Structures are given as C-alpha cells and as structure tokens.
Paper text:
In particular, IFT144, IFT140, IFT122 and IFT121, share the same domain organization, from the N- to the C-termini encompassing two tandem WD40 β-propellers (WDs), an array of 12 to 20 TPRs and, except for IFT140, a zinc binding domain (ZBD). These four subunits are distributed into the two modules; the head module consists of IFT140, IFT144 and the C-terminal half of IFT122 (IFT122C, 706-1246), whereas the base module consists of IFT121, the N-terminus of IFT122 (IFT122N, 1-705) as well as IFT139 and IFT43. In contrast to the head-module elongated conformation, the base module adopts a compact configuration. IFT121, IFT122 and IFT139 together form an enclosed oval-shaped ring with the N-terminal TPRs of IFT139 (IFT139N, 1-694) extending out in a solenoid conformation. The short linkers (~5 residues) between the WD40 propellers and the TPRs in IFT121 and IFT122 constrain the locations of the propellers right atop the IFT121-IFT122 TPR junction to form half of the oval ring. This conformation is stabilized by extensive contacts between IFT121 and IFT122, which bury ~3130 Å2 solvent exposed surface area of the base module. On the other side, the ZBD of IFT121 fits into a helical groove formed by the TPRs of IFT139, constituting the other half of the base ring. Notably, the base module oval ring is sealed by the very C-terminal residue of IFT139, Lys1334, whose aliphatic sidechain sticks into hydrophobic central cavity of IFT122WD1. A salient feature of the base module is that, IFT43, the smallest subunit of the complex, adopts an elongated configuration and traverses the base as a molecular tether to stabilize the ring-shaped architecture. The N-terminus of IFT43 (IFT43N) travels along the surface of the two WDs of IFT121 with the aromatic sidechains of Trp9-Phe11 and Trp33 deeply embedded into the hydrophobic pockets in IFT121WD1 and IFT121WD2 respectively, clamping the two propellers in a fixed orientation in the base module.
Intraflagellar transport (IFT) trains, the polymers composed of two multi-subunit complexes, IFT-A and IFT-B, carry out bidirectional intracellular transport in cilia, vital for cilia biogenesis and signaling. The IFT-A complex is composed of six subunits (IFT144, IFT140, IFT122, IFT121, IFT139 and IFT43), mediating both the retrograde trafficking (toward the base) driven by the dynein-1b and the ciliary import of various membrane proteins across the ciliary gate. Here, we purified the IFT-A complex from protozoa Tetrahymena thermophila and determined the cryo-EM structures of the IFT-A complex and its subassemblies at a resolution range of 3.6 to 8.8 Å.
Author numbering:
A (entry chain A): 1 to 626
B (entry chain B): 1 to 797
C (entry chain F): 1 to 49
C-alpha cells in the first residue's frame, strides 16, 4: 500500500551533435535479484539491487552504436547485447570468476537489430531486427537466419519453452513453434509494442499471450489465434507489460508517465510512481519460495527506467487489515483474499475476491467484505460447528471510507472528518460531522438500531455516538491525538493510547487519570473479570490487576485479545493463544482476605490443587459457602 | 524405523521368481515363474483379533496357477481400479485376465500378441484407463481399457523405459543408450532432460547422451507437477552409480544420492515418505543382495540384507505400506517394517498421535483421552519432534526461511504455553520432569520450565535477575562450564567438532550425552559440570536410564543390546547377550525390572532373568506397577468411521508376579496372603488387597491393609462406615466411595427410602441430577426451588 | 481357456476389437484423518456484472 523510493542514479551526460543519447531503453533483472542491468547510448551499466553503486565500471567501445535490449538467461550466466551496429553479442557471466563479464559469441544480421528474447528451458536466443530474424543454439554454434517482410519490434518465449510470439508495428502478431513455422497469424490495424506470456500456474496450467496494442487496449490470445474476447480498454497507450512470478500481478506503464499495478483479471490496485516522462521499461523482482516456506511476502520491488535518463527503484509494502470479534479471526491474505481462522483447531477458510479488499469487519455470525465499489455480507449457520457462508445481500453502491464497520441492520463508514450511517439497501441514512479526522472507532453492543459507539478525533476529544440520537455526547477530552481505545467489560474504565505510545486509564464515573504507562504498543481488557488489563510493548507483555505489581513474560508479539485464562499474541500475520497461571493473583487476594474476588479469580480455570488450597483457606477463616 | 524378516513363501516348482506385483485395494500378490508359472494368492493378516491366532493362519487363500504360457514371464502388472491383470512373455504375447465370481477362477480376456517384436516395458495410467506398450523397434501403442487404439506411433530412437505423469497428460521415455525425453499424450516431442547426477563418468564434451544404461525411473503418483515448493517426487537411477531426485521435470537443481550398489529397482511408498532401492552390493567383499531405504530428501534410513548371497529383483509394497514383498531367486521374502510413528503418551491417559497428510508437508495431531473417549484435533504445518511428560507435551517444529526451530509446551487439551525459539538443529530431543534438552550435531541446549519443588517458572515477580527459568546452551568438545542466557542472534553455531553426538538421556538430577566414537559424558543438573567419562565400544542408538540412576541399557546401531553399570570413572558391562533388540525401557518404580521387545516379541526381565515371550504387534506406552500398556497405532490409522474404543486399541499386560498374587488371593485365605504380601510391601499390592477385603465386606483385613499403606483418609472412612446398622447402606456407600455413584443409586432404589439418594446427590454436588429426580417425584416446592436456584448459580458461574 | 480370444488394440489385419466389461469398479476410501485436510474450503466471489 505504501510505495517508497529506494535509490536513484541519474545519467546527465547528454551529448549534443551526436547520435548517442542519455536515454535508457531496457533494464534486465537477475532471477535471484542480486544484480541489475541497464543500457545507455554506447554503454552498459551494472548495479546492485539493494544499494545503488556500480559494482563494475561502465563498459565503452564494445559496440559502436546504441544498445537496444539487454536480457538475462533465467539462470544468471549469460548476456545478450543487440546494437544498431547490425550485431548481437553474447557474453558469459559469473560473479565469482575474476572476469565477471566477457564476450563469448558474436553474430550479425543484414540490418539493424531491434528486439531479442531467450528460451527459459533450452537457453536458445531469438533476435529479430529489420528485414531479418535469427535463431542461435549454444550447442551447434550455427545461427539460422531468415528474411521477413517488415521489422519485428517485440518477442517473448513461452514459459513452457515450446512457443514463440512476435509483434510488428504493421499490426501483425505471429505465433510460432521452436521450428519457426506459421502456427498462427493475427492481423490488426495498430502497431504492436509489448507482449508477454502468462506464467504457468497449478490453478490455471494454460498459457495465453497478453499483447498491448496502441489503440488503448490489451488483448488476450490463445495458442490457435482465437481471441478470448477480453479486449480490455485503457485510457493511455501501453508501452511495457510485465508479469510477476506465479502470475498474480501485472505491471503496466506507458503514457501519462505513470507506472500502475493491476490484477491478472484487470482490476486496478495502485500506481507506483509518476516520473514526469515516458517510462520505457519497468521490471519486477523475482522471488524464490522454499519447500513449505512460511512468509507473508508482502514486500515487492520494482525497477523503472525513464526517458530523461533516470533508473529508479521503488519498494511497495502492503499494510495489514484484520478483524477479531469472537472465536474467529478474519485477516486479509495476499491481496484479493480473505482468510478466516479459528483459534481452537487452527482450521482456515478462504474467500477469494477479484477486486482489492479495503476493510474487513465481522459482527455476530456476519462477515462484511469491502471491495472496490462493492459491499458483500456473509452469514453463518449457527447450529453446525463448522461455518457455512452464504451471500444474503450485495451492495452495488460506491462508498469510500478508511474505516468500515457493520452492526445489526446497519453499516458505519468513516470518511475524512465525517461518519455516515448506511442502510443495508444502500441509501444513506444519517450523517455526523466532527471538527477533525476520526482516527479510531469502537463498537459496543446493544439493541438493534440502537448500537452505541466510541469515537476518537485527531484533536483527542473522546465522543460517544448513538444511532438514533443524531447528537454526539462528549465523553471526555484528551490533549494528544488518539490511536486506539478500549472499554472494560462492565463499562467502568477506559484505556486510551496516544500517538506517542502512551497508555492512559480513565475512570468513567470520575474522570481521573488513575494509571499512566510509557512505551505501549497495544492493550486489551478481560471479558470475564472486567479488571485485568494486558498491555504489550514492543518486546514484553505485562498483565496488571487492581493495585497489584505487574507480571512479565518476555513473550514475543503484540496483544490483540484477552479471554478467560487466554491471551492472543499476534506476530507478523499469524497469531497464537497462551494460557496464564492465576495463582499469583489468587495468593495476593488471599493476603488481603478478599475471598469473594479470590474465588472469582479461581473460577477462571485454575488447577485443582489451588482449588483445594482455597477451600482450606476459606474453611479456616470461617467462610463456609466458598 | 526398523525392518526385519518374516514368513518365506517357498518355491512353486523350483523355478526362479523375477516379477512380483502386489495390489493396493485387496490383497492379491502375484509372482511369475520360469516355465510360464503365474501364481496369484492372498497373504496372511499381520494382526488378528486381540491375540495370537490358535491356527496361526497358515492358509493360502487362493494360490492358483494360471499357466497358459510356454515361455517365461517377466512383466506382471496389476490394475488397481479394476480386477484386470496384465502379463507378458518373451515372445511378445500380452495377456489380460479378469476376476469372475466363481471358485477362484481367472480366465483370459485379452489374448493380443505382436510377432517379430520384443516387448520391453508395459505401463498403465494412474487413472487406470490407458495402456502404453513399447518395443525395441520404437513403435509406441496406446490403448484404452475398452480396446480402442488411441494411437500407434513410430519413433526413430530405441526405447527402454516408460513412465507416466500423475495427471496422465504426458509421458517420459528412456533410451537404452541412456537419456530422458519428455513427450505429450499425443506423441509429440517436448524436450530432453539434462542429467547432473552422473559426474566424472559421462563424456566431458556432451552430457545429453552418455553410455550408461538406465536402471529405473520412477514418478510418485498423487504428486504436484506444476509447482516448485514441494518435496522431490521423481527419481532417476542408473545401472550402478548415482541416483538423482527432482521435485519437477523442469527442475535444474536435482538432489544427488550415491550408493555403492548395482541399482535394479526403485519403488516409492504408498504414502511417499520413503523409497526402496533393491539390488546387489559388493562392499562385503562378494555379491550380497540388499535393499536400501531412503527418505524423500535422502538419508539412507536403513539397509536390509537377505541371508542368501544372491540377487534381489522385484520389490512391492503393501496397500498400507507396512510390509514388503521381495522376489529373491526361488522365493518371495516378506519384510516387516515398523515406522517412526511420532507419538506421545501422558500420565493423564491422553495419547497424542501425529498423522502425515498426502501433501507430505502438513501434519495433524490427535489428542485422544483413553478414559472419557474424547477426541481433539490440531493442525501443525511442520513437525520435527514430539515428546511427553507426566502432564505436559513438547512439540518441536521448524520454521522455513528463518532457519529457526520453535519448541512449545501443550497441556492435555493442546493450548500452547511458553513457546520458545532456537537456532539449534534438533538432532536429538528429550524432556524430563523439570527440563527440556535438545542436542544438535555439536551443540547442547537445556531449558528449565519447572522450579525445584512444584510450580511453573513462567510467572515470577521477585528478583530483578533471572533466578528460575533460565536457558543454557554450550559446546560439546570444549567450554564444559555452562554459559549464561543465550539469544537467537547473539549465540554462534558455526564451530564444528570432530566427535559428534548421537543420543541424549535425562533424569531428575542426571544427564547423559553420547558420542559416536563411543564416549558418554555425565552432567549434574544444579550446576552443569562434567564428572565422569564412560567408554563404550560401539556407538549407542537408543539408550535408557534407570530410576535412581544405577544402571543403563545400551542398544547398538546393529541391534545388539547390553547393560552398562554406571560407576565413578569406570566401565562394567553385565553379560546379557539378547542380540537384535529393538525396544527397551526401564521401570520408573522398580529399580531393576525392565521390558524389552525384540522382533515383535516382548520380554520382561528382572535381575538378568528373562521370562517367556509374548507375541505383540503394538507399541509399548508405559511400564507402570507390574503393568505394561500397549497401543495398536496401525488400526488407529485405519479407523472406518471415526470411533475409537479403549476396549479395542489399548491392551494391558500384567507381570507374572501380579498374576501369581491375584491367583493366590482368589484361591488361598486372607492371613496367608497378608504374610505373603508383607515381604513385597508394595503400594499397588496393598491397594488391591484392601479392595478385595472391602469387596468381601471384611473390615479387619481392610483396616490392616490401610494402616500398612499409611493412609489416614481411608482410616477415617472406615471408622465412619463401621458405625452402621444395615447391610445395604454399607455396600452403597462403599460403591459411592470407590468411584461409582450409579451403583449406589441403584442399591438405594432397591432398598427404597429415596431421601438418602437425593441427599447424597445433593452432597456430591450434581445439581442437574437432583433436579431430574425431584421432578414429578414428590412435588416439594421448597426443595425444587432451592435446587433450581443452585442450578442457576452453577450455570451462571 | 481364452473366453474371448481376439486380438485387441488394432494388432491384427481384420478388425476384431474386443469388448471388456467395466462394471465392477474398485475404489479406495479416504482416511478420516486424511479427510480433515479439506477444512480449507474454496469460496469464489459472485461475479454478476
């Protein structure tokens, strides 16, 4: 969701009165991603992906003309440099060897070379220029050159290694086999610039050709040449098309000087950068997953090349949105997915959407999915232990809100400094306007059409909202901005955290700062005893009772929920349950002769030995009922 | 895992056996002979009822010969979807049979034969709907089950080996010269595989076409073919040399395995956990028939050697994968396999069982209560180790991508408590009453989860510094002194020692660490410091520690077992022999008695005096007082409908001492048994004597047993009972005292006077039952109202 | 015996294809601990535009 620049290297060596320019055309990326390439007029540039610095000095004089394309070999061992000198060089590459790069095999066409592609499996080279296309096989070292009628502009080998696809500015798209025969021909009326093959996938296991035409369209073509009928329209003319690994994303660049991201279906997600100029080539960092590896893999890396001569690197990080009400934990998986996990049996349930999910809120046996310009609601069959989800209703209305919640027969959306109440049909019902941005909102239970809520503002004043009152009730005031709020089981106290990670406990009956704590990341209240408060810092979690010394665990994670003899700890995006011994508070309560509260604490599932000890203590002190 | 031998089916007519096929759904093993001798028969069950079969089975259920052939047969294939059986000869005659519901009669249904050609390898599709037939000429014929020929193509290159993909979409060819080619289902060439396995043997210039013939290529079915994050599922072996494993056909980084044998046949597991390679080995100085088992990653788990000095050709697995049929010369040997079967047993009675899914990556843990018959389930992605203690269980799992291992504790239900993370590879893990010790190849890690007396050292607020609940980690070679608290980033693992460790044992105050060279190091728990250095000739494998730490049992890698007496800087080996032992366990109550099980035979040994063996096909759970608990995990794996009964799985075996004591009790009088029990003076014997005395309604003997047991509550109970008048209230109260309230209620109903029943039910604290009893019984308003108020309070709490 | 006794899969000259019955089908029942692997159920989204 957040896109941050990493490192930028600019090439200002413009040379007027010379055909060599400062533009950059292509940027090849290694499969591992430890090395990066770029091509400039009369030179090549080698970069480190993580930090921007030339590992090797710029090579000059090898090709007397510009460099049109640079590609790897899917194994990080070969170079292919095509130049306007009517020649293609193939270099050997190896990081550990003293010569990191050195020319290996050079050949030449009859005219200038324009595009080049590699074979993922057999590592064969297909180079297409004006009037000619050539195929090179490493084993035989004998090139096969053939003539054409117009200059090919783009080529791409299928991930199966069997098919080949090329495009011409005359509008002709040709699909051939490894023997270079006219398997399929398609005639269009606009030039062809960008082509790609969809990656193989166990869910799909079929390869189709995605080609971006200059009539503001992207088309999907089958092997036989029959179009799939998508013909998705675009506002801008595309220039480059790149598919992420496993066929999950699609990076599209071109006119309007913007680099945008899309799903494979065509749903817009975000834009990466606006370079104020045409972006000739953008590439995505490949990723390698181990056998059964566990990782969120939220991080993404892109490399962009602009027409001015800037080779920039951007890092995209996806934020975490999740919801937890009871016995269920619904969190957003890899984008366009919702996973509901049960804390007891660790079983998961997956719901797949096509557009990006923005907010997930779960009420009693009701799950609300907030898709782009769509709202979905799913229910649960309570009688069966396993949950069955069925779509009762769908909302087509477009609603924008950074926070969305669902209550019985109503929906609440927070946008800017306003709160909107939506009926399930879709029509707006009620409005609330506050001075500053509404940061955090908490929903408390109640009757249908009468559910209250707490609202925190950027100023810090904490307000209460009722559905039918339409008049905010000022609860209290806080000087610093509010980040998160919580309410006690009996609505007796309220814990509020400021932007400085400062935790404060306010009594509702008497507005007084009873408790203050520094460096607090999260906090939670018990749902059965109403008194225990568990707050987690960056490394240590503390549980505190009434007028008692704190207890430390050195538990790695953040506290999300507290239930009877249970604490939920969430690390990264997976969470677990930890049991807590209640003997310490038992003994402390026994010290002050408060047998009722001690028995209430003991009722939270303590060992039978402590039950016997409490029974003996109560019997000695003449308390026969306990 | 362990492997041993079993029944040996004899020669049919003194003819060599070279092809054996075992069905998966029903048990029908077939062997081919020399002069057209095809025999299909059923095999004896491994476990029958809950004991040894009086007839010992010993009956060949079918055992019928289907000859029809004058020449020899060397390809016999079973259809698993249907009853079809395919068999070919040297003269290119392919015959397909089917089963008709008559007196075990198989008759021909396909009689096809192509002349002037030689058949090499026939294959069936995993779905069972296609047949691929290839010859040495090059022609490939694909036929449906019905009989319609899909296509009969001709190939220029000669063909030697045929394999099918799990999805049957495409196939793999291997030429006699040696090379792998990928073809589609329509006979079109896709590509040629590259071999990195054969190093220094191939021609340096070209590697696609070496001069080494292919032994066997095998693709494990039910495995993903369009993914990269999966354990390897395809294997390619050459005639004698290296074998390579690939997780996919397009993989360019295969896993290498080298074995010093002539590979003849490689067969995968029904579950895919391990694969067996059969053939001949010359390491013993001559030709010895061997079968080597390898994991999916490849670790050479075990090696089975046949008594005969000859070849081992043809290996088949049972449907469940518990038995192996191996055709050696003129016999079909049956090898029995006992897998690892990660399982844990608590003193609560809960049993934790780990089951592997078909993904081979994910595991399911079942917590089954042996008393209340409850069943809870948990899903754990990766499992490395599972261990149990009196009331807690330890799970050691691995996180991929961080090279870390998570060790967590779980109660009977399975709620995690105080999970920790380490960077130490769990080569060998143990967990005693108050510690958890995990040992890598060269590092040792200890962690305290309980304090000195009895309490969890996770919630403590007294001293600023860490007093109880500290984690230590040290080296094996040097740095004997224990280090301070380690971290997942501060601690270093890079240094390596020449003498690696193999097994570790723990006690209440002692720790033992073994070494491969034959050295055992002793450590004390209050402050870790080496004291003794024991010497053992052979490397230990399992090891065990006796209560009080007086003796120990050493099991060698070859299976030999002996007893070692631990003494200050000494070495005493008590002569016991008893080779080929597999399981050993010392009693936790009797300092001397122990149980060891050898080749599916259990022996109870005390003071180096063994007893009669007992045939058992289960695993030993615990050795409690004069009792051994065994559980059959194989039937747990094979449950029909999801009900587990403690009367079927769990079995209890009593020692001869307890049996003799019970016999003398049920036969002889009371005073003689009292003086007989006096010498033994054991808690269980006194408890049983008191129970019997109370059952016969005798109080004097019960009082004597209770004073000898030193139990004040029992004396108070007996004193309360003795002041009674009738004969019925005493029995009912005794029944309620033991564990049984229903019997007491029934006898109360027999004697009527239900107010005692209602008062006892109120006293015991069950409020639903008294509410049920009072309804429509007497109509008492006040009692019913009070009972309902108490029930409401109980439900609210 | 050779109840049918006819060349199959197009091996002879004269077309003499056989008919083999495919009525008795043997299937393997999945284990219940294995049958609990499907807890991760797939739910597509209702795409009616």
């Amino acid at each position: 969701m957040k896109c941050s620049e990493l490192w930028t290297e600019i090439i200002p060596k413009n040379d007027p009165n010379s055909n060599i320019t400062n533009q950059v055309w292509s940027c090849s990326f290694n499969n591992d991603g430890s090395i990066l390439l770029a091509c400039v007029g009369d030179a090549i540039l080698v970069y480190d992906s993580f930090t921007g610095n030339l590992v090797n000095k710029a090579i000059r004089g090898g090709q007397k003309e510009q460099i049109n394309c640079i590609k790897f070999s899917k194994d990080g061992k070969r170079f292919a440099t095509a130049s306007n000198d009517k020649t293609v060089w193939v270099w050997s590459f190896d990081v550990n060897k003293n010569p990191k790069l050195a020319p290996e095999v050079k050949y030449s066409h009859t005219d200038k070379v324009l595009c080049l592609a590699f074979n993922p499996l057999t590592h064969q080279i297909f180079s297409g220029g004006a009037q000619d296309y050539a195929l090179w096989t490493p084993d035989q070292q004998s090139i096969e050159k053939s003539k054409f009628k117009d200059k090919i502009i783009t080529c791409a080998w299928s991930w199966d290694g069997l098919y080949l696809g090329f495009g011409t500015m005359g509008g002709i798209i040709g699909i051939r086999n490894r023997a270079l025969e006219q398997l399929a021909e398609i005639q269009r009326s606009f030039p062809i610039w960008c082509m790609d093959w969809t990656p193989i996938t166990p869910d799909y296991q079929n390869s189709v050709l995605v080609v971006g035409v200059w009539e503001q369209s992207i088309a999907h073509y089958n092997i036989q040449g029959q179009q799939l009928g998508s013909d998705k329209k675009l506002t801008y003319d595309p220039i480059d098309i790149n598919f992420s690994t496993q066929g999950e994303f699609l990076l599209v660049s071109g006119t309007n000087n913007k680099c945008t991201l899309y799903t494979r279906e065509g749903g817009f997600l975000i834009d990466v950068a606006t370079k104020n100029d045409w972006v000739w080539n953008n590439k995505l960092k490949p990723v390698i997953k181990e056998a059964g590896s566990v990782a969120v893999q939220d991080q993404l890396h892109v490399a962009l090349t602009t027409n001015d001569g800037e080779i920039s690197m951007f890092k995209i990080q996806q934020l975490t949105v999740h919801a937890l009400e009871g016995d269920k934990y619904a969190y957003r998986d890899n984008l366009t997915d919702i996973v509901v996990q049960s804390m007891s049996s660790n079983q998961r349930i997956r719901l797949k959407c096509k557009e990006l999910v923005k907010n997930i809120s779960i009420y009693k046996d009701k799950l609300a999915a907030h898709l782009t310009e769509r709202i979905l609601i799913y229910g649960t069959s309570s009688e069966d232990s396993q949950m069955k989800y069925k779509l009762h209703k769908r909302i087509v209305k477009k609603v924008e809100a950074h926070i969305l919640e669902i209550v019985s027969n109503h929906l609440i959306a927070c946008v800017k400094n306003k709160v909107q109440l939506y009926q399930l049909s879709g029509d707006l019902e009620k409005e609330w306007v506050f001075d500053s941005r509404v940061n955090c909102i908490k929903i408390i239970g109640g009757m249908p059409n009468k559910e209250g809520a707490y609202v925190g503002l950027k100023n810090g004043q904490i307000f209460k909202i009722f559905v039918d009152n339409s008049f905010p009730i000022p609860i209290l005031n806080h000087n610093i901005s509010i980040k998160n709020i919580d309410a006690s089981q009996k609505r007796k106290r309220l814990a509020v955290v400021d932007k400085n990670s400062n935790l404060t406990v306010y009594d509702l009956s008497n507005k007084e700062q009873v408790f203050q704590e520094m460096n607090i990341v999260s906090c939670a209240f018990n749902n059965n005893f109403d008194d225990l408060l568990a707050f987690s810092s960056t490394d240590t979690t503390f549980i505190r009772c009434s007028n008692h010394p704190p207890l430390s665990q050195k538990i790695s994670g953040q506290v999300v929920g507290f239930k009877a003899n249970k604490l939920f700890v969430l690390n990264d995006n997976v969470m677990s349950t930890i049991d807590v011994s209640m003997t310490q508070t038992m003994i402390k309560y026994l010290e002050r002769k408060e047998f009722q509260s001690a028995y209430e604490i003991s009722l939270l599932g303590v060992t039978d030995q402590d039950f016997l000890y409490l029974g003996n203590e109560a019997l000695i002190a003449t308390q026969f009922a306990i | 895992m362990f492997v041993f031998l079993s029944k040996k089916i004899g020669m049919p007519n003194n003819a060599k056996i070279e092809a054996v096929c075992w069905n998966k759904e029903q048990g029908w093993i077939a062997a081919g002979g020399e002069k057209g001798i095809l025999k299909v028969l059923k095999i004896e069950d491994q476990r029958q009822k809950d004991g040894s079969n009086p007839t010992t089975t010993g009956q060949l259920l079918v055992n019928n010969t289907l000859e029809y052939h004058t020449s020899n047969v060397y390809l016999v294939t079973w259809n698993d979807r249907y009853r079809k059986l395919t068999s070919v000869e040297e003269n290119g005659i392919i015959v397909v049979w089917a089963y008709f519901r008559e007196l075990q009669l198989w008759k021909e249904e396909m009689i096809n034969d192509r002349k002037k050609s030689v058949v090499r390898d026939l294959k069936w599709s995993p779905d069972g709907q296609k047949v691929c037939i290839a010859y040495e000429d090059g022609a490939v014929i694909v036929g449906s089950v019905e009989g319609s020929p899909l296509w009969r193509k001709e190939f220029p290159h000669k063909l030697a080996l045929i394999e099918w993909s799990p999805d049957s979409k495409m196939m793999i060819f291997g030429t006699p010269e040696g090379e792998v080619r990928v073809y589609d289902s329509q006979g079109m060439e896709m590509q040629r595989l590259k071999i990195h396995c054969l190093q220094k043997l191939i021609d340096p210039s070209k590697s696609f076409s070496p001069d080494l013939p292919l032994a066997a290529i095998d693709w494990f079915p039910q495995a993903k073919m369009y993914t990269d994050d999966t354990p390897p599922g395809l294997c390619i072996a050459y005639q004698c040399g290296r074998v390579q494993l690939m997780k996919n056909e397009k993989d360019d980084e295969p896993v290498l395995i080298d074995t010093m044998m002539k590979i003849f046949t490689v067969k995968w597991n029904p579950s895919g956990s391990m694969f067996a390679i059969s053939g001949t080995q010359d390491e013993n100085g001559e030709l010895k028939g061997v079968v080597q088992f390898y994991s999916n990653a490849g670790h050479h788990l075990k090696t089975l050697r046949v008594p005969g000095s000859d070849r081992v050709t043809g290996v088949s697995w049972e449907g469940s994968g518990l038995r192996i049929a191996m055709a050696v010369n003129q016999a079909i040997f049956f090898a029995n396999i006992k897998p690892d079967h990660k399982w844990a047993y608590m003193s609560d009675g809960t049993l934790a069982f780990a089951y592997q899914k078909i993904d081979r990556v994910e595991y399911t843990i079942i917590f089954w209560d042996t008393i209340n018959n409850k069943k809870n389930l948990k899903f754990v992605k990766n499992l490395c180790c599972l261990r149990a203690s009196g009331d807690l269980c330890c799970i050691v799992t691995e996180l991929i991508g961080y090279d870390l291992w998570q060790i967590d504790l779980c109660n009977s239900i399975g709620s995690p408590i105080d999970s920790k993370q380490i960077n130490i590879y769990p080569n060998a893990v143990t967990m005693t009453k108050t510690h958890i010790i995990v040992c890598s190849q060269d590092h040792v890690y200890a962690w305290q989860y309980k304090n000195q007396v009895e309490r969890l050292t996770t919630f403590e607020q007294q001293t600023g510094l860490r007093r109880v609940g500290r984690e230590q980690a040290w080296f094996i070679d040097k740095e004997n002194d224990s280090n301070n608290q380690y971290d997942k980033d501060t601690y270093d693992v890079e240094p390596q020692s020449e003498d690696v460790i193999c097994t570790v044992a723990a006690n209440e105050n002692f720790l033992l660490v073994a070494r491969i060279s034959g050295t055992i190091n002793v450590y004390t728990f209050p402050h870790i410091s080496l004291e003794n250095k024991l010497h053992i000739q052979t490397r230990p494998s399992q090891m065990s520690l006796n209560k009080d730490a007086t003796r120990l049992a050493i099991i060698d890698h070859n299976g030999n077992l002996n007893i070692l007496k631990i003494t200050p800087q000494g070495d005493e080996l008590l002569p016991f022999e008893k080779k080929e032992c597999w399981f050993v366990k010392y009693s936790d109550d009797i300092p001397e008695s122990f149980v060891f099980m050898e080749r599916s035979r259990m022996y109870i040994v005390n003071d180096q005096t063994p007893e009669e063996p007992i045939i058992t096909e289960g695993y030993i759970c615990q050795y409690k007082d004069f009792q051994v608990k065994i559980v059959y995990l194989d039937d747990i794996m094979k449950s029909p409908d999801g009900v587990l009964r403690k009367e079927e799985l769990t079995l209890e075996i009593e020692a001869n001492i307890l049996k003799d004591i019970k016999d003398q009790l049920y036969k002889k009088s009371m005073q003689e048994m009292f003086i007989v029990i006096k010498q033994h003076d054991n808690d269980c014997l006194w408890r049983v004597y008191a129970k019997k005395a109370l059952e016969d309604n005798d109080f004097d003997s019960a009082e004597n047993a209770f004073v000898q047991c030193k139990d004040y509550a029992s004396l108070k109970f007996l004193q309360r009972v003795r002041e009674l008048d009738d004969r019925e209230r005493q029995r009912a109260e005794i029944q309620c005292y033991f564990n049984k309230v229903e019997e007491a209620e029934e006898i109360y109903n027999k004697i009527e006077r239900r107010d005692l029943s209602i008062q006892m039910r109120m006293k015991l604290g069950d409020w639903a039952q008294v509410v049920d009893q009072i309804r429509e019984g007497t109509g008492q308003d006040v009692e019913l109202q009070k009972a309902r108020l108490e029930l409401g309070n109980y439900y609210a709490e | 015996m050779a109840a049918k006794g006819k060349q199959g899969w197009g091996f002879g000259g004269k077309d003499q294809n056989v008919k083999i019955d495919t009525s008795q089908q043997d299937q393997k029942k999945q284990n219940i601990w294995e049958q609990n692997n499907e807890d991760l159920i797939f739910v597509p989204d209702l795409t009616q535009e």
